[PDB]
Amino acid sequence: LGEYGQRFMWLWNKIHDPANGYFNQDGIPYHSVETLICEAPDYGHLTTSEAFSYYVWLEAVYGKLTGDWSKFKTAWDTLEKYMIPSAEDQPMRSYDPNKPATYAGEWETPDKYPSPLEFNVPVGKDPLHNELVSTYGSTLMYGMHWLMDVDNWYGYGKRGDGVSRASFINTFQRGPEESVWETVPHPSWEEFKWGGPNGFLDLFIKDQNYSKQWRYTNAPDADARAIQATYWAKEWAKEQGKFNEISSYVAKAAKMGDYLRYAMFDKYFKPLGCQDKNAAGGTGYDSAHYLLSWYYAWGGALDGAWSWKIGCSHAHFGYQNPMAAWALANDSDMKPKSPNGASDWAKSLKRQIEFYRWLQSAEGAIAGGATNSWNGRYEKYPAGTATFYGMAYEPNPVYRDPGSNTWFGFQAWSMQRVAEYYYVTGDKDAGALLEKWVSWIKSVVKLNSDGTFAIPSTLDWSGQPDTWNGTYTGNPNLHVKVVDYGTDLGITASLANALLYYSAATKKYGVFDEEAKNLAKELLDRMWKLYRDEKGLSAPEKRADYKRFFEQEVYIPAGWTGKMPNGDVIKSGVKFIDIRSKYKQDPDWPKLEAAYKSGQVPEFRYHRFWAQCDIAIANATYEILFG
Template sequence: MPATPAFAATACSVDYQITNEWGSGFTANVTVTNEGDPVNNWSLGWAFPDGQRVTNGWSGEFSQSGANVTVRHPGWNPDLGTGESATVGFQGSISGSNGVPESFTLNGTACNGAEENAAPEVELTSPADGATFLAGEDIELAAEASDSDGEIDHVVFEADGTEIATDDSAPYTATWSGAEVGPYSVTATAVDDQGASTTSDAAAVEVIDEPQLQATPANLSVRQGGTATFDVSLSNAPDAPVDVTVERTEGSSDITVSEGAELTFTPDNWDTEQEVTVSSADNGGALGSAVITASGQGYGSDTVEVTEIDPNTSDYEAAFLEQYEKIKDPASGYFREFDGLLVPYHSVETLIVEAPDHGHATTSEAFSYYLWLEADYGRITGDWGPFNDAWASLEEFIIPETEDQPTNGSYDPSAPATYIPEHDTPQGYPAALDQGVPVGDDPLAQELSSTYGTDEVYGMHWLLDVDNTYGYGFCGDGTDDAPAFINTFQRGSQESVWETVPHPSCETFEHGGDNGFLDLFTDDSAYSQQWRYTNAPDADARAVQVAYWAHQWAEEQGNADEVADVVSDASKMGDYLRYAMFDKYFKEIGDCVGPQQCAAGQGKNSAHYLMSWYYAWGGAMESAQYPWAWRIGGSSSHQGYQNPMAAYALSEVPELIPESPTAAEDWATSLDRQLEFMEWLQSSEGGIAGGATNSWAGRYAQPPAGSPTFYGLYYDWQPVWHDPPSNRWFGFQVWGMERVAQLYYETGDERAGGILEDWVPWAIANTEVGTGGDFAVPADMEWSGEPDTWDGESTGNPDLHVEVVSHGQDVGVAASLAKTLLYYAAASGDAEARTTGEGLLDALIANEDDIGIAVEETRADYARFDDEVYVPSGWSGQMANGDPVEPGSTFLSIRSFYEDDPQWSKVEDYLANPDGPAPTFTYHRFWSQAEIATAFATHDNLFG
């Protein structure tokens, strides 16, 4: 029952938002606003209409009796003054419908918030999205606006958030004069007579200093003896017809303009693209290239580089080259260049929130896919320069250098790190260091130092702020230096990306609070300036996997020497990657319960030999009076991170076996252990369940009674993170199985083949390939039951089940699935696997656009832009841009830069009207686009 009120609230309102939903569960945020007298020791109550159950909650103390839920205030936020709000969140279970509660109480008093004013509607009708204007030209603005429960008071036109003009009567128009050269995001905001407002979708426009001629794409492949096309248009309307000449200006005379050599654009058709056809001579000569130039009086010129490819090139190889050219075209926006080296963005678009919380951040995953893209290019063209450049960029920008990790020489392998317990929710942080908990010996450090002559760690940090969007700069110094190492997730399994506080990897106390951001995460008696990095093992393992194939392909061409240095560096990376095989605090593996009771490891009895979710290392700043350093492994292993192909390369291939004396033996053990792990986790349907841990709940807690085990590790259906549940996403299935399929193709390993024999039919049964680009691949999965305890042989796990509960059109996942099926088909002869794989590739081709392959997607989770980010009571600080960080801060409030994003108005409207349709976006994620390209190349490699 609700608590007895200390002060009765005369009025209150509640906003109940379901933030994520799957077959048997959901997460929700509930915000209560006190609109009456101040309330002490608040308590919120409601009744579920459909039998929902709260399974865990945060920002309040939850209890439930039947349908009735009560949430008492957290200790740090007991009171609600007039106008104040509090937000709680929870994860719940459902068994059917998931209706919203109809009524709420605050301290026993029913909440009857004032009826909301309906927001107005508005559409920006001029300028058009993508329009181009000349400097000095007037830009006409126009919008249509209406209000269902009143009248429009005025409409404000803005460019990049700066007001241009206001109109208070229909038709709503204005003229923008004097716009300077540059790109702009133009919006119209309608304000009604009750003060409610709505902002239109943005129109991206550009002001240029002189008219331009535009030829796309910038790079084009043509089969020898064949033809290919590109398009030409004008940037601005001419006053009179403009004649455009298109001709070869450089390169091979075998490449000619066969149609469209003379084009005419008029004031009526100037923005209609006109097609140009180039032809390659069918003379069997050496393959060449040429530059085709389009030029028009008063509009300058633009060029297209055309490259001949072999006439016997398969359709999928041609598709690879087309996709490759789009990705590498600077105009597409996938990379930022630094001193001749390219750094891939997470996505072309900036407004995207997933593991990286901004599109122009990047990850070690993106670098590993960049490497893969260039490896396939080297196989097809024989040009290994771009592959070597990709590794040079990886080494330069996302592997910390000496200046980034300066005090490793102070590391003591006999005391690798101080124990810090993990907590279930961010509200459990900062977590106290516990010097009294025993930790084991690090068995790798001395071997690695002796082998490579350095105490530094050679591994990628997982997250990079490519454009320095957050403003931390090098080592948190606030300069404009980019890219900059940053980090986010630091506070337990329930901390979603929506609840993180991004911070510099190098903590100098320049930003945040008195101790920088350290005291948001750890509770210590004193804080030191320090650096720390976190490795995502699947990315490093993928880089090794790609280096294996680059070596194989280059060797077949007689070019092995060209990639030898990169292969050697990948071997070295694999040597350090062994840290992912060890328990976080190097404690003994197996039946590890209780931080005090779980024994400190000696030698390698702390190795589980799987790929854990991370390993990490850090230390004091070089200026520290008493320098120190630390290293940790990872106790939890997710099936999607396993890479038996990399383990095979690092244990069996001479060029990739690391130099350390025990590395090959460790990786050989890991190869066997990883395959066993997937056999143990395979459900009776075929899907691979979550994983296992040596440290339940991240603090060596007691796992549920009867938990099945794998070499003493406890089964965990959602290892590592819970919001959303890990291993719910089908992408982790295909990432892992693609590596198993490669191993099966390359070695014929019977264990790999057996896993695929059960997995592939399940995946195909849940995949649909239609016509005209229609396809559907699994999206979300639901798990029930448990595997049998592992005793060395698979039982088939009759009590472990998986159900695909939703499907989608994730183009990256579709490409990964296609690659998996094609490798399996090539190894086994399975005709259905090949047919399905090819069908997915054809569907992807049918969804191509100017810069890649993409489909529109709906982002209902963007309601969480207003999610509160937990900040302890009494803590306050600032982001580098001045955004305050304090109790009550939200994801958006500490990332105010999003309000200037060209696509922000979509989210803003959704937040203002959460019952309306969720916003849609078309995203070009780098990993997806590279995966698509390499899927095309995979077919060409396997089937010609």
Template sequence: MTTPVSRPRLRRRWPLPAALGTALVAALLSAVSVQAEPAPSSDYEYSPVAERVQRENPELTQYESAFLEQYDTIKDPASGYFREFDGLLVPYHSVEKLIVEAPDTGHATTSEAYSYYLWLEATYGRVSGDWQPFNDAWASMEAFIIPSTADQPTNGSYDPSAPASYIPESLDPSDYPMPITPEVQPGQDPLADELSSTYGTDEVYGMHWLLDVDNVYGYGFCGDGTHDAPAYINTFQRGSNESVWETVPHPSCETFEHGGENGFLDLFVDDQAYSEQWRYTNAPDADARAVQVAYLAHEWAAEQGNASDIAESVDDAAMMGDYLRYAMFDKYFKEIGDCVDPASCSPGSGKESAHYLMAWYYSWGGAMESAEYPWAWRIGGSAAHQGYQNVMAAYALSEVDALRPESATGAEDWGVSLDRQLEFLQWLQSSDGGIAGGATNSWEGDYSEPPAGTPTFYGMFYDEKPVWHDPASNQWFGFQVWDIERVAEYYRITGDERAGDILDSWIPWAIENTTVGPDGEFAIPADMEWSGAPDDWTGTSTGNPDLSVEVVSHNQDVGIAAGLAKTLMHYADATGDEASLETAEGLLDALMEHQDDLGVAIPEVRGDYERFDDPFDAPNGGLYVPEGWTGQMPGGDVVDSDSTFASIRSFVEDDPDWPRVQEYLDGGPAPEFTYHRFWAQVDVATALATHGELFGETDPDPDPSPDPDPSPDPSPDPDPSPDPDPVGSCEVVYDIASEWNQGATVNVTVRNDGDEAAEDWALTWDGPAGEEITGAWNAEVVRSGATVTATPVGWNSTIAAGGQTSFGFQLTHTGQAATPEAFALNGEACTTG
């Protein structure tokens, strides 16, 4: 593991009984926001880099220069995006403290924010050649949001044959606490022993999703009330209808020092006796993004000859991806497919419980180190949301040598996951182009029977709004962008036609619902409404004629607008689509019209802030605490059946922006806030840099046609060999995409210009001397003597007449990568392009 520059003291934190496997991670939404008073500047030293880096790299484009300016703004202590601990920076969710989203305060942070911190520094490394900030970001993540040995001390007592006690979920928070049901048998955990033997530890290497950076709640380390920070905390625990407004923040390490007699455990789990414990919940989309970014960093650093600078961090990313496989498994390791009734649904053995998708969470916990009889538990996730899928991470962990996990089956599992995720998105794609919600192996969280006729995907049930319903998880356009951006980047890199088919439908739909005008005017989709359902998945997309989506509102979310711009740029670079590049550039230019001293931001109206003082009122919701339950927050706020969101977070009333909220609660207008979310500012920065990377300084024609020859040859050059027969001919484009000291990556496109399909194709060529193939994607590429042969991987075994396929590979060389002189497809000579 990477050793931090200055590692803070070991922290102890503790979770719920083996029963509390019901933790639900919330979507790290940003759909709505607030204009709050910026926090005081953090106290750390920073020297601006934009002027120096531009001077040292005069070839940088105007967009890359804009990236550097945005980078300086984010890193400037006066802006307030970070807090420094022992020489390492921890990002806040937002500059402003008074903001309620999935994090209920702006000076919390999330694994999402950390993954964006890595993205910011990886992009800076590409532009500047300086990779120390990227390593520092990884060190901070490892120090503060990946639980240390002392934070998860009893994993050695974990029994993979009995991963966790079953606790049913309920949709309604007022049904909690839910009972432990020991008679329901979980399946076997097939990962634990493999991971322990591979890495020599029983610990889990993954991020917990939420930190109280300033220790505003006061739980401190291990719930002991100290003022050391950051502190592991959690919120969501009580089913799909529990919104952030209905949560009770509690420590990840439960010592019974706060809350009621049993701490906060008996708000969530009905048990005969309660134990002091620790527990953590992973948000797989964040860990997958961290892996994706590590892949990008590796590729960029390798192109510079600097791969060794970040080799240790990249190794850790591969390890993180190995543990991230827990998100591929049913919550209680039950068999995948037609899993109805927890008692009769078969416990899984081996990989029978793997759906190979990115679920909403995985979680782990155990007893305190001082327990007389220590125990530990682990759970996967039964529900998969389209917005959490990451084909880039799956590609990197299965196909790229530097990111392939060390375990025996890790890379293989990620290869299956790559195919499964692409199928999943094909299955969920509406006839309009948008991607619908997801699927679950546990209907309503308790393996209930779904309504008759519910469509299935590998036996999992279609769920139009998986995991959370307040607000419905299929409404927010941001999940579309986050997911499809990764698909577009994957398509640009690999040319996988399955990804291209998804994009060919999604991109026009997104552009049709996006407008860009003069002087910073723009609007992107905000909320969507869905109707119908997909067809059963049989391995081939039907186009889902009965599934449709309508964009019902628009907004100016700066982070999602930037993410959409990146998506469109990847697609434009891959296809030459002019409309995509034009829309992307229009969005970037519009965003730059909304710069302020802290970055890029646009005011938002927060009508939902009326819920600050909502008491519980069945069936209308509100903060539910059972009658007779009484406890206290660390600061003395009483928790009982009369509590509200604000009453157990009384610190919000000390915020300079609170009077505007109070005025609203008293009957005034909904308040307007201008928020500076960390992840959104990074999305803006990286979108600017992406333009510079892909398109350079000028405004290029994305689909150029060659200029006509101004003076045609009066006599053609003699052709030393007869022209090939045009029937059955082919064309090969061999592109050395990147090259470093003794290696290179190559992208190959094979076009079949003949009248008949090329079945089970094989492309051959003589490899230049000194070159060796070290890895490939979308084809099997082997060298025997001087001959290199590329063959399909299954899904691309046929190249239709007039069609094409693409693949790529990595090689080593002894001097310089060279382009072969001739190619043959199934024995027929090809032209080169």
């Protein structure tokens, strides 16, 4: 191994040293080593399907670089055992594909919840269910639930037992203004053992009566990442004559891909462009946007009296993955077993790439995405709204606190997958898209004289794209603005990765963009010079938002009372920390509390698992492509 592959092995070893504490005792990676953190998960020893995806990717690269596929197989084994709900977790009975769910609106503020079920709103047909049951002989949905309480910190345990590790939980339920700070963490398996008389159900959905039930929520970007990772694992293992070793792992990915088509459908299977909650439901694929939406979700009564499935009407460019889509569409090893799996993915591949191109700003950054459900209630679009196969442009799909596309990290994460795609296929549209985004990137990244660097941290947006008609117009009235800069190391690494794939691609298919490679190499080297530490790499970051631990009110309706597993009482007026009193026993709590009582912005040096993974993988990627 060269210099870069050595950097990978160094960080890999830091990640896998059990004294460093990246993984729990079951081998499940945590969101971060440090427990005091709040940003998407609200505690650092939760974990995410995202973390698991990065774990698979990390070990794929380990296989490439060492010839040893045991790390990859173990990563998948743990993913499947713990993060995919098992048969007993998702006992689905009495599903009706002609009636997939009952509609409820999305609402602008958390105080509008619980959202009423509206029983007359028509819901469309689910065209996947029968095919998948016929294909696999099961109602089991093979996809990751997004959020896990790894060491049962919240107390829900496994299927209501209050004690087991790897406890499925959820948070976000109450629309676009429910920040990470404004949620009520609740179990996926609802037995009424906590919360109120109806457990947590009646904070979120208003119904005439309530039953015990389960539900899970997929994060399609993560599942798609895990597929992307697996594609490279099988390419890299075939190069070594080790295909059969990972053969069964490639099949898991192909199956994950098959179920991940639920992410391609409107929430309530309503036709694209309907702009009316009272319109008739779709009859098949007229409700497919063929994008990786923000989620799919599924549920069932513990009875077996009913079950349900939803997609999502909102798509963010940040979620898309042309590399996974291409693999499922075109690579015979990754072909899903269903009749329509691969064809559906080929449609999604092309729709995705058009989506990215439609959202490309005048400068080259990618704008947020689009919705088939304006305001989350199938409203009529404002006059003058730009559209994409009948979906309305949104600058900040799904969330507004903060705006989902104010985070520059989507640029890197998502464009990295397009750069891999372009590297493999030479697709001209993907190349033209990349060339303009790379041009923007070079103009915004700061390489300081003193050897430091900064990348955009927050973005803001103005205007709209032109309505899509199959070709890119330049979007001269759509603008990005860089609001501030930072040293997010996971994102920096991800951007270097994107730039490396793109550069390698231009060498194969056109004029070698050597500057792109050099910028990538500068970022990776300056980072390595500056930010190594005992557990991997970190850079200081200020978290002024952490005032919200103490100050953020969590909406609870007047008159509703319940309890968390540790006895914390849930009622009107409670703050973030009031329903998470165990935070006060965190090792860093005294530090934060003193910083807060004292008027000062706390500062942290985090080891996020995904970031350490992105770092390792980007350094390895230099070796694989250019060494």
